Design a protein around this ligand. Structure first.
Ligand SMILES: S=c1[nH]c2ccccc2o1
Ligand SMILES: [Zn+2]
Length: 257
């Protein structure tokens, strides 16, 4: 019954998911002056040329664009990672206003939205097993700021009216996720967790420094989605982000400068 309302939002999650107050929870604020450059960090390897998207689903919390992860197709490697991580889905977190929406923050700055490209470590066989491991997932986080339109995001925006409510899905084949990436792959990285229940501490976070720009019309359409199912009172799907959590005993490393 968890969600993003006053009654079941982030401040309530710890009751059903005690790990919400754990030692490596996400998101976090990225203090740019405190993040240390790690010359040993390798360039990130994002290989999405063979990606096979399949479907887009409104799950009542956000919408997921799902991929075929039964083979090494779209994969993330390098950077802070050991091994190969397969892309399984991507989703976003956004706000009701352009001044809020991202989960991670940069020197306390909030972006209008944040894209999460979720990948799982192939050494664990499947996603369900991977989330039970400290190095099971690698999530590539990309900030969205409002300005010029992002062409590669338009196919997603255009299909949203067909998955307006919780439980609705639609075919979403032949979508190229490379169109959602910024020019630079410079990043910050730290050990964290899923940002919605079950809040499992299985994620190596890789957050890109360069945000992508999307238009006001594009994000406006995200805000027309519904948290509710069809035939239920309309609750706009906005502010589906968890605020920054205590960094605790962790160091955020930078791949640049
Ligand atoms: S980020 C991110 N990826 C996730 C996958 C499953 C459940 C929660 C999640 O949060
Ligand atoms: Zn997420």
């Amino acid at each position: 019954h968890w969600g993003y309302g006053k009654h079941n939002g982030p401040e309530h999650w710890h009751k059903d998911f005690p790990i919400a107050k754990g030692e490596r929870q996400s998101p976090v604020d990225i203090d740019t002056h405190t993040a240390k450059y790690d010359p040993s960090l390798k360039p990130l390897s994002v290989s999405y040329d063979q990606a096979t998207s399949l479907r887009i689903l409104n799950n009542g919390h956000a919408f997921n664009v799902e991929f075929d992860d039964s083979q090494d197709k779209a994969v993330l490697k390098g950077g802070p990672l050991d091994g190969t991580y397969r892309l399984i889905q991507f989703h976003f977190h956004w706000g009701s206003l352009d001044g809020q929406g991202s989960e991670h923050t940069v020197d306390k700055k909030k972006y209008a939205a944040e894209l999460h490209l979720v990948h799982w470590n192939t050494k664990y066989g499947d996603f369900g097993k991977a989330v039970q491991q400290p190095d099971g997932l690698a999530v590539l986080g990309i900030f969205l700021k409002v300005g010029s339109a992002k062409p590669g995001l338009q196919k997603v925006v255009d299909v949203l009216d067909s998955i307006k409510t919780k439980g609705k899905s639609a075919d979403f084949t032949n979508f190229d996720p490379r169109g959602l990436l910024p020019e630079s792959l410079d990043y910050w990285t730290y050990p964290g967790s899923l940002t919605t229940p079950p809040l499992l501490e299985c994620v190596t976070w890789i957050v890109l420094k360069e945000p992508i720009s999307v238009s006001s019309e594009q994000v406006l359409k995200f805000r027309k989605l519904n948290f509710n199912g069809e035939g239920e009172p309309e609750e706009l799907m906005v502010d589906n982000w968890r605020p920054a959590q205590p960094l605790k005993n962790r160091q955020i490393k930078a791949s640049f400068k």
